Amino acid sequence: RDGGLHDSVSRSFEKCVIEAVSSACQSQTSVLEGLSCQDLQKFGTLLSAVITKSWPVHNGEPVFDVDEIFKYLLKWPDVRQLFELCGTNEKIIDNITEEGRQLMATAESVFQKVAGELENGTIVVGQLELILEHQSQFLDIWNLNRRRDVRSLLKRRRDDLLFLKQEKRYVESLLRQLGRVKHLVQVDFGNIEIIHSQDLSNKKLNEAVIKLSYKRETHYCLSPDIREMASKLDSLKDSHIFQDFWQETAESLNELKVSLPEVLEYLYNPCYDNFYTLYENLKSGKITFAEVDAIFKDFVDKYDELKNDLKFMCTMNPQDQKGWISERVGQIKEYHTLHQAVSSAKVILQVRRALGVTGDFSVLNPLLNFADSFEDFGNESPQFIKAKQLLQDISEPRQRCLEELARQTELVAWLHKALEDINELKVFVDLASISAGENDIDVDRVACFHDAVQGYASLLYKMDERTNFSDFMNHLQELWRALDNDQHLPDKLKDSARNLEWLKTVKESHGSVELSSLSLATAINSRGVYVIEAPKDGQKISPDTVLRLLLPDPEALRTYSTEELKELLNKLMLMSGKKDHNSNTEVEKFSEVFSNMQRLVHVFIKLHCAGNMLFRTWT
Amino acid sequence: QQGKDLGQYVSVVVLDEVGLAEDSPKMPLKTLHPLLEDGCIEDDPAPYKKVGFVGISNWALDPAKMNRGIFVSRGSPNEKELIESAEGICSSDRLVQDKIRGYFAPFAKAYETVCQKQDKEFFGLRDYYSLIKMVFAKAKASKRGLSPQDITHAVLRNFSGKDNIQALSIFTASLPEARYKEEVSTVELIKQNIYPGPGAESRYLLVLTRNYVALQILQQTFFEGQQPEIIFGSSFPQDQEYTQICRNINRVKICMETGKMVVLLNLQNLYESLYDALNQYYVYLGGQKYVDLGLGTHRVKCRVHTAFRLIVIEEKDVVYKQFPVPLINRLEKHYLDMNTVLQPWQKSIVQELQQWAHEFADVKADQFIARHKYSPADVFIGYHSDACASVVLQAVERQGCRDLTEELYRKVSEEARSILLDCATPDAVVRLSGSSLGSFTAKQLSQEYYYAQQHNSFVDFLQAHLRMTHHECRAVFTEITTFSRLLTGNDCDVLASELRGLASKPVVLSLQQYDTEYSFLKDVRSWLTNPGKRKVLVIQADFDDGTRSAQLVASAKYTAINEINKTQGTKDFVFVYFVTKLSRMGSGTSYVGFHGGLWRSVHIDDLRRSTIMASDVTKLQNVTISQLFKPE
């Protein structure tokens, strides 16, 4: 209940309800939906709370800007219940607030100004996009300010908006098609490029949509023929074949400032005629194989995009697409499989030539007899289909695999000379891990060579000198299974194959006079002696001339200075981790003993420079 | 070069930033003239002393040293050379290339506009190149053309970080189709750098920060499951800077070959040792990529795993004043303070929580003859200026669902109040009935301070904490503030006596006793290698002593978290308790806590369980002293 202006618990309840409304407006929940609040004073306080608190505050409580208030009207769903329960009963607006009614007045003034620019077409088109994406709320606020036609007006403004959008899209596609050829030619876009560079905060009547029917717009085209040029470029800009024809036609023209309406017959009409010529060739399929591998050279291994590209060619001449596309897709695909079979048969003859497996295959003779044959017809080569049955799924991948056996003849020569079977590899690997370096490239040469020869062990160890096609393919199948767990196997074969000098000198290596940094760290951590003296010569007391390391080993010894131990520490921090923790504890012991010795050198020099005479002769 | 055939082998000195050594007061390039003649100072000319020489530079040089050699210089690529470089990137696939060929000219003009409009040289060529690489990658992945969402993400990842540059304004002023309207948060851009979905590798991150608070956010929000290995400038005393640089490069190298993230809080000490790794220029061997890491004069190729990401977290002011312009141009800047990640309803919860904390603290009770006004820093220990944005972000991350509901909003508010009440002193909870919050809320806050929370002792807190079911957590990090004494060693034996069925002999480390980081790690690994499930670590610093054990805390926390993430197995659970001892005489107020991230803040006033008194001061609060002496 209420107890008037002096009842303080009602003032506390009103302040708490204002805080609850502000909390339900900082969250985007609805405050008033089904609130039977028949006492009009407290319902007026609720409405004043939702107006004052749901208002779009930014750095200041009022908004002196129309468009954010109009977005507030369109978006926030308590605004329509607000205007409904404000207008349907005239006894509620009388007790809101001075400030709440100021904000209500600003709300109806903003809605009246913006939606008053809407009967006439004077609306800024951004607000038109706003009202079209906010239809139902706008219709309800329009009804509440009309009761105090619309839908046909909204459909009319909607269709004029869609027309403006597709005309801007056509001009965009035209600009980009003529912008792909900026380093070939250049075209002057009348005044369309400055109009198209404008933002769309422009009024809608500035798009000139008048009659006396036909919708002329501020992209004033020099003819409707240029407009249909733009429409058919926009329908064919996503076709790669048309982009090829466009580029070669723009190259066929050759500081050339070209006007726009001569581009249409200089560059667009012959390109479109050649494009429709290729379309009508592909209709009945009388195109030659020469034009097939001259045009579709980018469409190998990719046949969903060629499906979409032929649909884009079919949308040019508007008829059906039932049996035209798929037959030609399969036909070009089969020609691609025949040519990959040609390249595969050439590299497989190269690999039986370089590998030394003579045997006899007697199966790929006409498929190489056809590589010198040149025929010009668009028909399905049927006798090659069974030939393709022995080169079905080799791939345009995996063919580098065979090709990497084909180029590395010196590698397989050395591997047959110096390995002779699979089981010597495991001593050679273990003999190479000693002879390789300590860093991360040098160690991984051994694992490259190991993985490469165990991947190609199906061929470079076990192939008999005379074989038919059958066992050759039946062990290439095992090669492809040994490939499908390591795709970088041709890389490992070529990388070990260019490491044959090191791979030869694995077993002919002498005793290398070199201290690996781990071995030197173990020698320092087991028999090394640190010495601090402050030298007796005329030298300074820098930390590089105070500390020494003496390493006894034939009873000579080696003296390491501070910078040589720092160099060792750097080499030791950056070497390849051998995945064992005895190495980790030797590196960590050397690091910590050197850190503590260097801290001792530091305190010793501080005592020396302080002038102490006790540590003057200390060692 | 000595002792080798000089017709089949050559050694080349490469000086990498000779423009910086140019007008240096030590004048090092003055040595460069007699060294390019014969490679020796005060010595006779010889074989194997004349070496090759390449000097690369970004700042200009004078040709009075470069009359000795051939000098190549370029000013800036112009617009057709930018389009040629974009086509040179996109040349690996011609279908995608003439799909996205329409965008090479507006991107080039927009990049030239950005390069004019920016004040300090901030955005460079690698930003444009990475724009072309991201656009090419997305158009290969979709095979649909380019959505305006793809263009706005590629622009807004590759041109960000600078505040007085509107990147989308410039790049969509040129082309008017990609006016993407719904907003793109820095959260999701940073996340799609850190976690990509499979030479198309992005740059690393430079997260620019106000007041170091970004690592707190990345730990609360992004770091799913695998914590990265924070590589940091250790503040233990008597640590040698050189060996710490060496060990930091060793940890970067191990994380590179493993495939785990690093977070660099000190790039300025490590930039000379990492500059070739940040350039993303690999060499290959068997499908393995190898990048050059260096220490001193020792550069070696180290293995980079295919899923290795790097984040440099750095202050925005330090990036703008320090950080050489070539280093900024490699690192994909994004800014992340706290106003970034807090949606505006969460900022309203921050404001409401600050008012609630001032009403919790401000009590009106002059029934005792005194005069003292209570800050919320006196009441909530660890409270500071920010301190509620931290609390709200912790509460939101505790919720999970994160759709604004008014049923979510209420529990973010109440979880934030629970987080604040968990660091309040019990005498303030007694004073709470004389506060503006009302006796009813004062009563329910006392109820869920003495019955829902566990502030009694450290062993009561452990017994209710070890029995919790911490989901998807292998380690639990809790910071504890106390006014009672630190645990001594007899207290550790008593504590392990009570935790016999739950814990595994908690190991109490005292932070004042560690000079070096290595000895601290020796004790942390000593604790970690002992067998047991639910092993407990307790690290102790008293701030009110002559020890400076107040800046060792972050180093100890980072060190323990890194060693736990790289050393803990799969069976055991780990419980870390940093205990900090403060005083009523001033250090409890000057203390800055509510360290978010992965640390939960708790104030336990008396760490020891008391035999004398009841462990609920409400039951002492309804009786009077004479009723304390009533017999049976």
Backbone angles phi, psi at A86, to 5 degrees: -85, -40
Reduce the secondary structure of A135-188 to three states and give it as a string. HHHHHHHHHHHHHCCCHHHHHHHHHHHHHHHHHHHHHHHHHHHCCCCCCCCEEE
- Tell me how far the alpha carbon of residue B59 is from its chain's centroid: 31
CB proximity B290 to A under 8 Å: yes
**Running DSSP on this structure, what letter comes out for residue B108?**
H
Q: Which B residues 537-566 touch A at CB under 8 Å?
A: none
Position A599, amino acid: R
CA distance A199 to B563: 56
Token pair of A449 as six digits: 């060579």
Backbone angles phi, psi at B588, to 5 degrees: -70, -20
Q: At what angle do helices A66-75 and A98-114 cross, to 10 degrees?
A: 90
Closest CA–CA distance from residue A361 to any residue of chain B (Å): 33
List Cβ neighbours of A520 (8 Å cut-off, separation of 6 or more): A568
Q: At what angle do helices B125-142 and B148-158 cross, to 10 degrees?
A: 150
Q: Are A248 and A184 in contact (CB under 8 A)?
A: no
Closest CA–CA distance from residue A383 to any residue of chain B (Å): 34
Length of chain A: 619
Position A613, amino acid: M
The neighbouring-strand residues paired with A510 are none
What does this entry list as its resolution, in Å? 3.2
CB proximity A14 to B under 8 Å: no
User: What are the DSSP calls for B158-223, one per residue?
Assistant: HS-S-TT--HHHHHHHH-SS----S---HHHHHHHHHS---------EEEEESTTTHHHHIIIII-
CA distance A138 to A380: 63
Closest CA–CA distance from residue B630 to any residue of chain A (Å): 43
Position B189, amino acid: L
CA distance B390 to B382: 11
CA distance B623 to B628: 7
Nearest to A205 by CA among A299, A275, A120: A120
CA distance A57 to A551: 77
Nearest to B601 by CA among B459, B455, B470, B491: B455
Nearest to B599 by CA among B629, B554, B566: B554
Q: Which A residues 428-447 touch B at CB under 8 Å?
A: 439-441, 444-445, 447
CA distance A586 to A521: 7
Backbone angles phi, psi at B314, to 5 degrees: -155, 150
CB proximity A384 to B under 8 Å: no
**In chain A, which residues have their Cβ closer than 8 Å to the Cβ of B98?**
180, 240, 243
Q: How would you class A50 by CB atoms within 10 Å of its CB: exposed for 0-12, middle for 13-18, buried for 19 or more?
A: buried
CA distance A290 to A428: 53
For residue B46, count other CB atoms closer than 10 A to its CB: 11
| Strand-pair category, A529-532 with A257-259 | unpaired
- Tell me how far the alpha carbon of residue B21 is from its chain's centroid: 33
CA distance B370 to B436: 19
The neighbouring-strand residues paired with B299 are B294
- Tell me how far the alpha carbon of residue A551 is from its chain's centroid: 56
Question: Is A452 within 8 Å of B286 when comparing Cβ atoms?
Answer: yes
Work out the angle at residue B134's Cα, subtended by the Cα atoms of residues B131 and B140, and round it to the nearest 5 degrees.
140
Q: Among partner residues A240, A439, A598, which is closest to B301 by beta-carbon distance?
A: A439
Q: Are B191 and B297 in contact (CB under 8 A)?
A: no
| Strand-pair category, B298-304 with B288-295 | antiparallel
Q: Are A545 and A557 in contact (CB under 8 A)?
A: no
Position B83, amino acid: I
Closest CA–CA distance from residue A469 to any residue of chain B (Å): 30
- Scan for tokens 């290795």, then name that residue: B308
Nearest to A125 by CA among A155, A157, A173: A157
Q: Which B residues 169-198 touch A at CB under 8 Å?
A: 176-177
The neighbouring-strand residues paired with A532 are A547
Question: Is B284 within 8 Å of A491 when comparing Cβ atoms?
Answer: yes
CA distance A561 to A546: 9
- Scan for tokens 């047959």, then name that residue: A416
Backbone angles phi, psi at A344, to 5 degrees: -65, -40
User: What are the DSSP calls for B583-620, one per residue?
Assistant: -TTTHHHH-B----TTEEEEE-S--S--SSS-S-HHHH
**Running DSSP on this structure, what letter comes out for residue A316?**
T
CA distance A258 to B4: 64
CA distance A274 to A243: 12
Q: Are B615 and B456 in contact (CB under 8 A)?
A: yes
Closest CA–CA distance from residue B406 to any residue of chain A (Å): 6
Q: Are A515 and A521 in contact (CB under 8 A)?
A: no
CA distance A38 to B231: 66
CA distance B124 to A377: 54
Q: How many CA atoms lie within 13 A of A323 on its CB side?
A: 2
CA distance A601 to A490: 54
Question: Is A574 within 8 Å of B95 when comparing Cβ atoms?
Answer: no
Using only C-alpha atoms, what is the Rg of chain B?
Answer: 30
CB–CB contacts below 8 A, A to B: 122
CA distance A45 to A256: 73
Distances (CA, A) of A206 to A125, A203, A547: 10, 6, 86
Q: Are B421 and B352 in contact (CB under 8 A)?
A: no
- Element (H or E) spanning A589, and its range? helix A581-610
Q: How many CA atoms lie within 13 A of A117 on its CB side?
A: 19
Token pair of A469 as six digits: 């096609």
- Scan for tokens 């004033």, then name that residue: A220
Task: Show the DSSP H helices in B405-437 as ranges.
Answer: 407-421, 426-431
**Running DSSP on this structure, what letter comes out for residue B380?**
B
For residue B298, count other CB atoms closer than 10 A to its CB: 19
User: Where is chain A broken, named by the residue before each break, C–N > 2.5 Å?
Assistant: 148, 212, 254, 380, 553
| Strand-pair category, B283-285 with A257-259 | unpaired
Q: Which A residues 239-268 touch B at CB under 8 Å?
A: 240, 243
| Strand-pair category, B12-15 with A547-552 | unpaired
List Cβ neighbours of A179 (8 Å cut-off, separation of 6 or more): B102, B105
The neighbouring-strand residues paired with B510 are B540
Token pair of A530 as six digits: 């640190």
Q: Are A286 and A376 in contact (CB under 8 A)?
A: no
Strand positions, DSSP E, A319-455? none
**In chain B, which residues have their Cβ closer than 8 Å to the Cβ of A240?**
95, 98
The neighbouring-strand residues paired with B285 are B288
Question: Is B405 within 8 Å of A196 when comparing Cβ atoms?
Answer: no
**In chain A, which residues have their Cβ closer than 8 Å to the Cβ of B348?**
26
CA distance A9 to A16: 10
CB proximity A451 to B under 8 Å: yes
CA dihedral B346, B348, B349, B355 (to 10 degrees): 150
Position B270, amino acid: L
Question: Is A27 within 8 Å of B405 when comparing Cβ atoms?
Answer: yes
Backbone angles phi, psi at A362, to 5 degrees: 60, 25
For residue A538, count other CB atoms closer than 10 A to its CB: 5
**Running DSSP on this structure, what letter comes out for residue B363?**
B
Q: Reduced to 3 DSSP states, what percent helix, strand and coil does chain A have, rounded to the nearest 5?
A: 60, 5, 35
User: Where is chain B broken, named by the residue before each break, C–N > 2.5 Å?
Assistant: 198
- Element (H or E) spanning B300, and its range? strand B298-304
Question: Is A591 within 8 Å of B246 when comparing Cβ atoms?
Answer: yes
Question: Is B286 within 8 Å of A491 when comparing Cβ atoms?
Answer: yes
Closest CA–CA distance from residue B348 to any residue of chain A (Å): 7
With b meaning 16 or more CB within 10 Å and e meaning fewer, what string describes A94-127? Answer: ebbbeebbebbebbbebbeebbebbeebebbbeb
- Tell me how far the alpha carbon of residue B14 is from its chain's centroid: 34
CB proximity A182 to B under 8 Å: yes
CB proximity A577 to B under 8 Å: yes
**In chain B, which residues have their Cβ closer than 8 Å to the Cβ of A168?**
176
Nearest to B518 by CA among B575, B559, B567, B553: B559
CB proximity A495 to B under 8 Å: yes
- Scan for tokens 């069974």, then name that residue: A386
User: What are the DSSP calls for B243-256, one per residue?
Assistant: HHHHHHHHHHHHHH
Length of chain B: 632
Q: In what order do the strands lie in the sheet with B288-295?
A: B283-285, B288-295, B298-304
**In chain B, which residues have their Cβ closer than 8 Å to the Cβ of A566?**
242, 296
Reduce the secondary structure of A403-438 to three states and give it as a string. HHHHHCHHHHHHHHHHCCCCCCHHHHHHHHHHHCCC
Work out the angle at residue A366's Cα, subtended by the Cα atoms of residues A365 and A372, and round it to the nearest 5 degrees.
105
Token pair of A354 as six digits: 């370089």
CA distance A93 to A101: 8
Position A342, amino acid: V
The neighbouring-strand residues paired with A188 are A259
**Running DSSP on this structure, what letter comes out for residue B240?**
-
Q: Among partner residues B105, B344, B405, which is closest to A182 by beta-carbon distance?
A: B105
Closest CA–CA distance from residue B350 to any residue of chain A (Å): 12
List Cβ neighbours of A386 (8 Å cut-off, separation of 6 or more): none
Nearest to A428 by CA among A445, A410, A412: A445
Q: Report the SS3 class of residue B351.
A: helix
> Could you tell me if residue A591 is left (phi over 0), alpha (psi between -120 and 50 degrees) or otherwise beta?
alpha
List Cβ neighbours of B563 (8 Å cut-off, separation of 6 or more): B521, B524, B525, B528
CB proximity A27 to B under 8 Å: yes
Q: Reduced to 3 DSSP states, what percent helix, strand and coil does chain B have, rounded to the nearest 5?
A: 45, 15, 45
Q: Are A22 and A29 in contact (CB under 8 A)?
A: no
- Scan for tokens 């008014």, then name that residue: B406
Q: Are A412 and A354 in contact (CB under 8 A)?
A: yes
Q: Among partner residues B145, B300, B345, which is closest to A440 by beta-carbon distance?
A: B300
Nearest to B212 by CA among B138, B265, B262, B277: B265
**Running DSSP on this structure, what letter comes out for residue A264?**
I
Distances (CA, A) of B589 to A303, A562, B430, B483, B515: 71, 48, 19, 12, 28
Position B385, amino acid: S
CA distance A65 to A470: 82
CB proximity A571 to B under 8 Å: yes
Distances (CA, A) of B128 to B99, B133, B159, B323: 18, 9, 8, 20
User: What are the DSSP calls for B451-470, one per residue?
Assistant: TSS--S-HHHHHHHHHTS--
- Give, rounded to a whole angstrom, the gap between the first and last alpha carbons of chain A: 95
Token pair of A195 as six digits: 């109009």
Q: Are A495 and A441 in contact (CB under 8 A)?
A: no
Q: Are B563 and B521 in contact (CB under 8 A)?
A: yes
Nearest to A369 by CA among A396, A389, A349, A395: A349
Closest CA–CA distance from residue B206 to any residue of chain A (Å): 25
List Cβ neighbours of B350 (8 Å cut-off, separation of 6 or more): B342, B388, B389, B392
Q: Among partner residues A441, A495, A573, which is closest to B301 by beta-carbon distance?
A: A441
**Running DSSP on this structure, what letter comes out for residue A616?**
S
CA distance A178 to A197: 16
Sign of the Cα torsion B441, B445, B446, B448 reads positive
- Tell me how far the alpha carbon of residue A74 is from its chain's centroid: 37
The neighbouring-strand residues paired with B380 are B424
Q: At what angle do helices A224-236 and A151-177 cross, to 10 degrees?
A: 80
Q: Which B residues 54-113 touch A at CB under 8 Å?
A: 80, 83, 94-95, 98-99, 101-102, 105
CA distance A53 to A69: 14
CA distance A593 to B164: 51
Position B533, amino acid: K
CB proximity A67 to B under 8 Å: no
